[PDB]
Structure 1
Amino acid sequence: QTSAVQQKLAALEKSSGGRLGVALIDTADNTQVLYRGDERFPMCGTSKVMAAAAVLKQSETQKQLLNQPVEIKPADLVNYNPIAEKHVNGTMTLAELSAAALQYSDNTAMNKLIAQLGGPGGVTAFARAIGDETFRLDRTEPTLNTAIPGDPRDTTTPRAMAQTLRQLTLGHALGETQRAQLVTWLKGNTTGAASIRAGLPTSWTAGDKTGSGDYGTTNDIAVIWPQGRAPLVLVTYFTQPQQNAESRRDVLASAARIIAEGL
């Protein structure tokens, strides 16, 4: 069946010229709303949540892991390193790297998280351990953002990512302390005001992780606390036909608005 909300999302997609994927979980009743929910999309930076969460999982059995120093060398710098560049020829702890990857989307920090997990396959292995059979990380930064249409590398589906984000932030995929840390990091994100958040009533609070890549790929995944009701988990993925397409965070805001108005 096609719902009123799905019809509005289809209209939005049509006017956007691209391909939109949406997955909402309303924890008030566990109901879901999906649009292209089982189609694959390039994750880009939204994959940083899985990497940080995997390191948080490791920290459950190593109390000092998050304080472990990691060397940052000039050769480690990639295409976007707002935090790591300050620490070249020095070190950053795994907590510092996690916070930089999540809150500033630092790509060198993400690479250190991936390395700590034994490579992209280590991130995928953690996804499998928490019941996500869909997620796949295949490359490091910056190539994991090529976002080529039809390419399965570094992709997931909106349904899978929403389920995983719910388990990580509201469920028991991580220990209580680690879940709280992840939520704190997401709520402190600096990059999300133009995306899902721009489509929500101002009174609502949220934590999110954005992503962008080639093909005008523009993504956001969020955990939301609406005024007067149980939290929501929302994933909005968007990708376009031309490699050099411009970002469209406004499309994510529009999708979020349709979802909020549809509650």
Structure 2
Amino acid sequence: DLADRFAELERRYDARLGVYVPATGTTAAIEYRADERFAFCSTFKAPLVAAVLHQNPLTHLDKLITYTSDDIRSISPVAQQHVQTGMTIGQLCDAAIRYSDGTAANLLLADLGGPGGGTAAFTGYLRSLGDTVSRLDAEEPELNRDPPGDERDTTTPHAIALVLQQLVLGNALPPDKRALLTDWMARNTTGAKRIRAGFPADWKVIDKTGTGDYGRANDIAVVWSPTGVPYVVAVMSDRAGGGYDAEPREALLAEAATCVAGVLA
């Protein structure tokens, strides 16, 4: 039983492990705490980019957005260097996926537009992909700091997985819009020590990481087999027992992913 190994890593790293791999024609689904709620954290920036892509035509990307020093609130390695010049919507998609830029996310959220920075617009977009569970209620960085047991800004390894299956493998976007999102994820720069570290090198890995308080660490990915077969992997985790300032354990995610690789090989 793969679940015993998934229940060993929890004890080993003292964490709560969630895993979900959508079943294919050739393989059953992998499930561990799949329908338990975990905090999005930064992983919501994947479906956030595809939202803006879906409501707006390709030219919307060349729209410039200006901002000030007060708009920078979370880790923003790209946004802090363009406060004077401003950024085009496309650049904020690149910053938000590849570098998990917090400000670009809050901006892309306002670009969706609506109540409370268009968080509701975002959940809305998740409801037209058939996901009725997930929700987003705060912005960066408060969405990372909700206490355990609270359902705000939460998702489930089961529900995000399917979302990413629809977005990268399905027909949620047109191909030329699907091309941009995939590339941004294939060039993500924050997922080296996670899912990307547990799959052999001759597997392809696109991903979007998520980190937060209470030892939260997420990586959602689409990996390709050396023969070209695609699968979707969702790994979410937190260490609430350790409290607010518990340390997130990346190795847990990399070790988990290796277990998935073994069954997927």
TM-score, normalised to structure 1, is 0.95
Q: 1:129 to 1:212 in 2, by over 3 A?
A: same
In the alignment, the residues of structure 1 paired with residue 178 and residue 130 of structure 2 have an alpha-carbon distance, to the nearest angstrom, of 17
In the alignment, the residues of structure 1 paired with residue 167 and residue 199 of structure 2 have an alpha-carbon distance, to the nearest angstrom, of 22
Q: Report sequence identity in percent.
A: 44
Report what 2:212 is aligned to. 213
CA contact (8 A) 1:38 1:158 kept: yes
Structure 1 residue 72, shift from structure 2 partner = 2.0
Structure 1 residue 147, shift from structure 2 partner = 4.0
Report what 1:111 is aligned to. 106
Runs (5+) with no aligned partner, structure 1: none
In the alignment, the residues of structure 1 paired with residue 62 and residue 25 of structure 2 have an alpha-carbon distance, to the nearest angstrom, of 37
Report what 2:83 is aligned to. 88
Structure 1 residue 79, shift from structure 2 partner = 2.2
The size of the alignment, in residue pairs, is 258
In the alignment, the residues of structure 2 paired with residue 165 and residue 101 of structure 1 have an alpha-carbon distance, to the nearest angstrom, of 16
Mapped pair 1:8 → 2:2: no
Report what 1:158 is aligned to. 157
Report what 2:47 is aligned to. 50
In the alignment, the residues of structure 1 paired with residue 203 and residue 7 of structure 2 have an alpha-carbon distance, to the nearest angstrom, of 25
CA contact (8 A) 2:239 2:248 kept: no
In the alignment, the residues of structure 1 paired with residue 75 and residue 25 of structure 2 have an alpha-carbon distance, to the nearest angstrom, of 38
CA contact (8 A) 1:44 1:147 kept: no
Q: 1:167 to 1:30 in 2, by over 3 A?
A: farther
Please tell me the residue identity of whatever aligns with 2:220: I
In the alignment, the residues of structure 1 paired with residue 154 and residue 260 of structure 2 have an alpha-carbon distance, to the nearest angstrom, of 23
Q: 1:215 to 1:221 in 2, by over 3 A?
A: same
Tell me the secondary structure at the aligned position of residue 202 of structure 1: coil
Please tell me the residue identity of whatever aligns with 1:251: L
CA contact (8 A) 2:137 2:153 kept: yes
Report what 2:62 is aligned to. 67
Please tell me the residue identity of whatever aligns with 1:192: G
CA contact (8 A) 1:72 1:84 kept: no
Structure 1 residue 134, shift from structure 2 partner = 1.4
CA contact (8 A) 1:147 1:215 kept: no
Write out per-residue CA displacement over residues 110-133 of structure 1, whole angstroms, 9 at most, x where no aligned residue: 000110112111110111111111
Report what 1:18 is aligned to. 15
Q: Structure 1: which 4+ aligned runs deviate by more than 6 Å?
A: none
In the alignment, the residues of structure 1 paired with residue 74 and residue 100 of structure 2 have an alpha-carbon distance, to the nearest angstrom, of 11
Q: 1:147 to 1:31 in 2, by over 3 A?
A: farther
Report what 1:225 is aligned to. 224
Write out per-residue CA displacement over residues 153-192 of structure 1, whole angstroms, 9 at most, x where no aligned residue: 1111100011000000000111111111111110010011
In the alignment, the residues of structure 1 paired with residue 87 and residue 194 of structure 2 have an alpha-carbon distance, to the nearest angstrom, of 29
Q: CA RMSD in A?
A: 1.2
CA contact (8 A) 1:26 1:230 kept: no
Structure 1 residue 229, shift from structure 2 partner = 4.3
CA contact (8 A) 1:73 1:90 kept: no
Please tell me the residue identity of whatever aligns with 1:232: Y
Please tell me the residue identity of whatever aligns with 1:49: A
Q: 1:66 to 1:27 in 2, by over 3 A?
A: farther
Structure 1 residue 90, shift from structure 2 partner = 2.4
Report what 1:176 is aligned to. 175
Mapped pair 1:249 → 2:246: no
Write out per-residue CA displacement over residues 7-52 of structure 1, whole angstroms, 9 at most, x where no aligned residue: 2111111222111100012545363111000100001000111111
Structure 1 residue 226, shift from structure 2 partner = 1.4
Report what 1:262 is aligned to. 263
In the alignment, the residues of structure 2 paired with residue 112 and residue 30 of structure 1 have an alpha-carbon distance, to the nearest angstrom, of 39
Please tell me the residue identity of whatever aligns with 1:113: L
